[PDB]
């Protein structure tokens, strides 16, 4: 695998968003991976709808929270519309996918990374952006501005984000808290400690879509 990865430099990452007060991190996580795989597979970089997942993933709980893997399964079975055709309203509503015309994109499956395994996650990121989870409730994570973050933070994960790259001592993470948080919306999380959870629980639960 390469020494350095950054899918932004391949034009596979859309601008940073802000989820607001809604508990929709799981949908923003999933869309990052969708935007990435469609660019890698088709050549187009486009913004897809987090609201559609919020409204239509019957296995999640709207603004109470949810699962990136179930969002990705829904996109594998049905598809997803463009974000501008189905914009973010910040509250759950009824599923309006049928009123939006044919889907803009569709994947063919979902895969899971074996947990607590830094190298398995690195291998997946080299192929495409990966949905991951972490503990974001600590003040240190909330006040982060740049550099390689070593914590403090525990492993009680609570927040889905996306890994869009890595380097020798870090993994590169795109958050959905606006550009005003972190390194222009991003954080470099330290890798290579002697902790099997990863720092901030980073290796707890990672998934990615597949698209023939
Ligand atoms: Cl280091």
Task: Give a topology summary.
Blueprint: E1 5-6, H1 25-42, H2 50-56, H3 68-77, E2 109-113, H4 118-127, E3 130-134, H5 139-143, E4 148-149, E5 159-167, E6 170-174, E7 186-190, E8 206-210
Parallel strand pairs: 4-7
Antiparallel strand pairs: 1-5, 2-8, 3-5, 5-6, 6-7
Helix pairs in contact: 1-2, 1-3
The structure holds chloride ion.
Chloride ion is lined by residues 148, 169, 190.
Active site: 25, 159, 175
Binding site for leupeptin: 25
Family: Belongs to the peptidase C1 family.
Characterise the protein shown here:
By secondary structure, this protein is α+β, with helices and mostly antiparallel strands. The chain has one domain: Cysteine proteinases (Cathepsin B, Chain A). The strands form two sheets. Strands 1, 3, 4, 5, 6 and 7 form a six-stranded mixed β-sheet that branches. The chain has a two-stranded antiparallel ribbon with strand order 2-8. The longest helix is centred in the N-terminal third of the chain and has 18 residues. The radius of gyration is 16 Å and the shape is globular. It comes from Carica papaya. Its EC number is 3.4.22.2. This is Papain. One of its GO terms (biological process) is proteolysis.
A few lines on this structure:
Disulfide bonds join 22-63, 56-95, 153-200. This protein is an alpha+beta fold and 212 residues long. Helix content is 24%, strand content 18%.
> Total domains, how many?
1
State the separation between the terminal residues, measured CA to CA: 22 Å
Shape: globular
Which architecture per CATH?
Answer: Alpha-Beta Complex
Tally the helices.
5
The oligomerization state is monomer
> Which molecules other than protein and nucleic acid are bound?
chloride ion
Following the backbone from N to C, one meets helices and strands in this order, namely EHHHEHEHEEEEE
Main sheet attributes: strand count, strand direction, barrel closure: 6 strands, mixed
Give the helix level as a range of percent.
10-25%
Give Rg in angstroms: 16 Å
Please report which band the strand proportion falls in: under 5%, 5-15%, 15-25%, 25-35%, 35-45% or over 45%.
15-25%
Class from secondary-structure proportions: alpha+beta
Assigned CATH superfamily? Cysteine proteinases
Question: How many strand segments?
Answer: 8
CATH topology, by name, is: Cathepsin B, Chain A
Q: Which CATH class is shown?
A: Alpha Beta
PDB class: metal binding protein
Keywords: Artificial metalloenzyme Hydroxylation Ruthenium complex, metal binding protein
Assembly: monomeric
Entry title: Crystal structure of Papain modify by achiral Ru(II)complex
